[PDB]
Design a protein around this ligand. Sequence first.
Ligand SMILES: CC(=O)S[C@@H]1CC2=CC(=O)CC[C@]2(C)[C@H]2CC[C@@]3(C)[C@@H](CC[C@@]34CCC(=O)O4)[C@H]12
Length: 431
Amino acid sequence: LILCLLSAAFAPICVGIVFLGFTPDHHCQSPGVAELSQRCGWSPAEELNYTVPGLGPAGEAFLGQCRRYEVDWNQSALSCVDPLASLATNRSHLPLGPCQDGWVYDTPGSSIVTEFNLVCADSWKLDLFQSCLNAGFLFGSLGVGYFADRFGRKLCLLGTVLVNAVSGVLMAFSPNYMSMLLFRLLQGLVSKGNWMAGYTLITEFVGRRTVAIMYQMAFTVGLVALTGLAYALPHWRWLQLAVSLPTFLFSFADLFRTPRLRKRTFILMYLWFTDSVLYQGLILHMGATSGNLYLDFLYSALVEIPGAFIALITIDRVGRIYPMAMSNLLAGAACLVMIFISPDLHWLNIIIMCVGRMGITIAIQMICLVNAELYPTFVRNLGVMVCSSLCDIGGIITPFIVFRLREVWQALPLILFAVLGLLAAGVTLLL
Ligand SMILES: CC(=O)S[C@@H]1CC2=CC(=O)CC[C@]2(C)[C@H]2CC[C@@]3(C)[C@@H](CC[C@@]34CCC(=O)O4)[C@H]12
C-alpha cells in the first residue's frame, strides 16, 4: 500500500514545521563572552544570568532574546561574580543594541529558525514558511484541476509525485531562505493534489469508509513516525531529507445562485476555514508553548487515533450534523479552558489539548461526509473545491495570527480559537 506511505509522507509537509522550524532559547552573540568564560568558567546558566539582559517585569522576553549590552568584554573584565554591577548600578542604564553578530541557540540540534536566523525582526519569516505552503496548497488545488485533463489522470499524478519528492529533497539542501520558500511553494502546489488523488484512487478503485479511515490512520502513523524521526534526527536537514526520501524511493455561480445553496455553501466554507484554523493553530501552539514537544505530539497523534473510530461509531447512530456541533464546541471549550490553566500544570494542559484535538478530528470526519452529501451530483466537485479553497485560506491566515498575537498576548490566539470554535458549533446547527 504505497498510498498509505503517501499519506504518511504528507503529514510532515503540512505539519512538520513544528519539528523543522522550532525556536530555541536564543540571545545576542556578544564577542568577548568567551574570553570572560575562559577567565572564569561559570555555568551556562550563569552565562545567561551575567550576560543576557533579564526578562521584563511583565514576562517580556524581547529585551533579552533580541538585545545585547554595549559594555566591553575584552577590557574592564576584572569582575566575574557580577561584571554588570561594576559597569553600572542599574542594569537598564547600560546601552542595549541589537544582535549585530548573530545569535546563540540553546539546542544541540539545528532548526530552520536556527539556520536562517528567523528570530526577532525576522520572526515573521517562520510564519511565511507555513503561509507559502498553504498558498501553494490553494494555487495547486486550482492548477492540478486545470491540468488533469491536459496530460491525463496518471501522467499528471506521476509528475506531481516526482515534483513533490524532488522539491523535498532539494529542500533538504536549500542554501538560503528564498530557495527554502520557493521549494515550500512548489511542494504545496503538488502535495495537496497528490493526497487528494491518492484518496480518490483508494476510494473509487476498491469499490469506501474502511479505506478512507485507513487513509487517515496512515496519516496519523505518518505523524507518529515524524515525531520518532524528529527525536532520532535533531537537525532539520536530516529530518527533511529522511522525510522526503520515502516518497522518492517509493461552475462557480452554481453554488451561490439560489438561497438554499448559497447559505449551505457559506456554512461549509466557514466550517472548513474554522476547523483548519483550529487544527493548524493548535498544532502551532503546541510547538510554540509546550516544553515536552515530542511526547505532547505523540500523545496528540495517539488521541487522533481513536477520534476516527469515535466518529465512525457516531455517524452510524447519532448522525452527522449533531456530532459536528458537539465536537466543534468541545474544541472551542478546550481552547477557552487552556487560557485559564496555570503554567505550573502540564498534565491538565496535555489532557485538554488531547480532548480538543479529538474534537477537531471528529469534526473534520463529519465535515468531509457532510460536504460530500450536501451538494448535487454536478456541483459536488465545485463545492468541495471551493470549501477546500477556504480551508487553504484559513491555513494561510493561521500562522500570521498564531505566532503574531502571542507577541501581544499569549492567550489571544487561544481566545480567537475559542470564539471561532463556539461560533462554528452554533453555526453548524443550521444545516
Ligand atoms: C491540517 C488539516 O487541516 S488536516 C490534514 C491536512 C489535510 C487537508 C485536506 O483537506 C486534504 C487531506 C488532509 C491531509 C487531512 C486528511 C484527514 C486528516 C488526516 C486531516 C487531519 C485529521 C484527519 C481527519 C481525522 C483523521 O483521522 O485525520 C488531514
